[PDB]
Design a protein around this ligand. Structure first.
Ligand SMILES: [Mg+2]
Ligand SMILES: [Mg+2]
Ligand SMILES: [Mg+2]
Ligand SMILES: [Mg+2]
Ligand SMILES: [Mg+2]
Ligand SMILES: [Mg+2]
Ligand SMILES: [Mg+2]
Ligand SMILES: [Mg+2]
Ligand SMILES: [Mg+2]
Ligand SMILES: [Mg+2]
Ligand SMILES: [Mg+2]
Ligand SMILES: [Mg+2]
Ligand SMILES: [Mg+2]
Ligand SMILES: [Mg+2]
Ligand SMILES: [Mg+2]
Ligand SMILES: [Mg+2]
Ligand SMILES: [Mg+2]
Ligand SMILES: [Mg+2]
Ligand SMILES: [Mg+2]
Ligand SMILES: [Mg+2]
Ligand SMILES: [Mg+2]
Ligand SMILES: [Mg+2]
Ligand SMILES: [Mg+2]
Ligand SMILES: [Mg+2]
Ligand SMILES: [Mg+2]
Ligand SMILES: [Mg+2]
Ligand SMILES: [Mg+2]
Ligand SMILES: [Mg+2]
Ligand SMILES: [Mg+2]
Ligand SMILES: [Mg+2]
Ligand SMILES: [Mg+2]
Ligand SMILES: [Mg+2]
Ligand SMILES: [Mg+2]
Ligand SMILES: [Mg+2]
Ligand SMILES: [Mg+2]
Ligand SMILES: [Mg+2]
Ligand SMILES: [Mg+2]
Ligand SMILES: [Mg+2]
Ligand SMILES: [Mg+2]
Ligand SMILES: [Mg+2]
Ligand SMILES: [Mg+2]
Ligand SMILES: [Mg+2]
Ligand SMILES: [Mg+2]
Ligand SMILES: [Mg+2]
Ligand SMILES: [Mg+2]
Ligand SMILES: [Mg+2]
Ligand SMILES: [Mg+2]
Ligand SMILES: [Mg+2]
Ligand SMILES: [Mg+2]
Ligand SMILES: [Mg+2]
Ligand SMILES: [Mg+2]
Ligand SMILES: [Mg+2]
Ligand SMILES: [Mg+2]
Ligand SMILES: [Mg+2]
Ligand SMILES: [Mg+2]
Ligand SMILES: [Mg+2]
Ligand SMILES: [Mg+2]
Ligand SMILES: [Zn+2]
Lengths: 65, 71
RNA sequence: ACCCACUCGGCACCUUACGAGAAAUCAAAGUCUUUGGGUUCUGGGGGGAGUAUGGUCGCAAGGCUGAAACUUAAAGGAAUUGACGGAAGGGCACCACCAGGAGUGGAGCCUGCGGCUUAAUUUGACUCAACACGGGGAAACUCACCAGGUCCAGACACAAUAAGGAUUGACAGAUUGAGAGCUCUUUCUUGAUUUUGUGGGUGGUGGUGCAUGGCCGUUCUUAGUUGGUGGAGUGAUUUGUCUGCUUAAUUGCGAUAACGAACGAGACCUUAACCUACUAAAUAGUGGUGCUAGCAUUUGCUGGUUAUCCACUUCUUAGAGGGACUAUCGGUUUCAAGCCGAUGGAAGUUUGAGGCAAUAACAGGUCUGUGAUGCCCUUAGACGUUCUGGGCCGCACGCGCGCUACACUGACGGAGCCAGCGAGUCUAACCUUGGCCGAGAGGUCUUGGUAAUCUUGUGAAACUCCGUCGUGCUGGGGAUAGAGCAUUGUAAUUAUUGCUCUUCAACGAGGAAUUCCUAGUAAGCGCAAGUCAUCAGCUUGCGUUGAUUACGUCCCUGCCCUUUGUACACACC
């Protein structure tokens, strides 16, 4: 998919030797968190903000200013 | 593949012949020098270059061929 | 006779496993390096071989006893994971079938393949996954093939020749297909650039795709791959990754010695759909106004006018947003994931259609895309290259993709008259409107456009309407062939293509077989783009007209999955 275009660089290189040639194929996948100028995460990613304990009750009452 | 055939007769090349040449020019009894063979009135060939003597034919070789002066 | 409880001794099964084992398994195969109850028998790597020999028993066939030389690095056991089967159980699918549509297979031609022919008819590829494929529509070119002619573009190093010239070129004639100084005659020219030799290079559409890279096709219209902590196992391993249900999906639910995750699917992206909401526009358009034509006249109706001005953004354009989440309701289901129906909705089949796409495999195709490349070959009488000419088109015939037909839901003739995706000329001749001339093809003079501006509303074709014909190989059909005219091109003969007249074949719905397909789909229909000087019966996309039939299954076929066997693991080639 699309994240491929966004996050992985590839290169093929032909390395000519005494016997024949070999194909080097390099693939690098870069930290998307660091994206900088694009999307900062995979389309996959789904973060939930973590609530907060509450200490409720305290029967009514009102503040004045 | 197939290899070879030939109803024969291979073609050769050329030679530039021999000739200890430019004897042509003649100097009299000490020491006046007269040119044999006439030279070229083309601006390109400042009259050092001569004309070969055939028949009808006098011809400038320096002009790689160029021009047909006839006397 | 039957039931309950007990007990000796039987044939066995069940569950455990403290314990054993290399494991499979075992109440003995336990009580074994913590090694001793009694006793008998047999084995000491594989083959050679239960062979030779002697003894013995037998009527015999044979039985008992039973060697060595020599050979050899394994043979063997159990389990694991693969692979594979002409074993069994499940699944998936219009490259399967059901219900059907439209066909192909029969005909003419077009076009590839075989075959034959040939100087040559260059060549790759042969089930799906070779044959309108190599973007492969070849007049030269391309081009590799064939008949023949030039050239070196043979780096560099060393040696040799050699300034008394190493070498170069050529006018005319001869030659030659040729206005190739190819060679020859002849005799000027050139000046250390070459020549000759060895060494070494270099080019090559020469060989090897069974030496390679890369790319691609196929498995795959598939759903699979792995790791953390836990559990099992001495171990390779296994569980997780599973009976079921569910999904297009190892998609999920559920079951659960597993829990929770990652690659792949999904998400993501592109395109087609919806925005009287946003921002705008003389390269898009609408309403008003002026200038103005025609018809009615009573307002009216239908046009002209890239700026005569004013306003707008519904339609067009493209930025930003919004929108759908199978929503609401109800059926059905283990009331789970889901599936179904109804309403709403631009939209509810993964929204439709694509792009991307893991792990692994193949001696799949490509050295003829590459100045990607190993090795082999070849290298001046070239397999380098170029030039002239022919050839890939050759025709008893077999095979594939196709085009056009057999007519009356039609052909012909008037007339109506509507798309979408494209593309177009700089140091050049591309897309072409308009005016004339021409029966046509075309010609000619001008013209707009490097483009939302011009071609172009690309006035496309099927289609619609009024006529002619009237079932007759007919006016269906248009093969083959003759004559003439034009276009591209240096070149049109074996006829590039276009036009006119004429000639008027087979084909009366196509045997056995066989392809493709579920909605704006199938089928019909044209167009633009690729190729392209010229040539589309091909492809790739596009819009126009627009159905019948399923919404299912495992019968055929194909494939995945379990279970199972394996002496395979280079893995049934
Ligand atoms: Mg995806
Ligand atoms: Mg002289
Ligand atoms: Mg056990
Ligand atoms: Mg035990
Ligand atoms: Mg017991
Ligand atoms: Mg032994
Ligand atoms: Mg023996
Ligand atoms: Mg005996
Ligand atoms: Mg005996
Ligand atoms: Mg007897
Ligand atoms: Mg014995
Ligand atoms: Mg014996
Ligand atoms: Mg096994
Ligand atoms: Mg059927
Ligand atoms: Mg049929
Ligand atoms: Mg060839
Ligand atoms: Mg296939
Ligand atoms: Mg040629
Ligand atoms: Mg030459
Ligand atoms: Mg040499
Ligand atoms: Mg050599
Ligand atoms: Mg080559
Ligand atoms: Mg291969
Ligand atoms: Mg390869
Ligand atoms: Mg081959
Ligand atoms: Mg399908
Ligand atoms: Mg499994
Ligand atoms: Mg695993
Ligand atoms: Mg799938
Ligand atoms: Mg009025
Ligand atoms: Mg009025
Ligand atoms: Mg708008
Ligand atoms: Mg509705
Ligand atoms: Mg979409
Ligand atoms: Mg092969
Ligand atoms: Mg290649
Ligand atoms: Mg090669
Ligand atoms: Mg190429
Ligand atoms: Mg390359
Ligand atoms: Mg060659
Ligand atoms: Mg051909
Ligand atoms: Mg064939
Ligand atoms: Mg085909
Ligand atoms: Mg008509
Ligand atoms: Mg005329
Ligand atoms: Mg102009
Ligand atoms: Mg249009
Ligand atoms: Mg008839
Ligand atoms: Mg006709
Ligand atoms: Mg011809
Ligand atoms: Mg021919
Ligand atoms: Mg007729
Ligand atoms: Mg029929
Ligand atoms: Mg052609
Ligand atoms: Mg075309
Ligand atoms: Mg083609
Ligand atoms: Mg067995
Ligand atoms: Zn001269």
């Amino acid at each position: 998919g699309q994240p491929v275009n966004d996050f992985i660089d590839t290169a093929t290189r032909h390395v000519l030797m005494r016997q024949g040639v070999l194909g080097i194929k390099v693939k690098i996948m870069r930290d998307p968190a660091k994206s900088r100028t694009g999307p900062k995460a995979l389309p996959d990613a789904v973060t939930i903000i973590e609530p907060k304990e509450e200490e409720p009750i305290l029967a009514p009452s009102v503040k004045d200013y | 593949x197939x290899x070879x055939x030939x109803x024969x007769x291979x073609x050769x090349x050329x030679x530039x012949x021999x000739x200890x040449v430019l004897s042509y020019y003649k100097v009299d009894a000490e020491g006046k020098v007269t040119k044999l063979r006439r030279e070229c009135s083309n601006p390109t060939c400042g009259a050092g270059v001569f004309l070969a003597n055939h028949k009808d034919r006098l011809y400038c070789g320096k002009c790689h061929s160029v021009y047909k002066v006839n006397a």
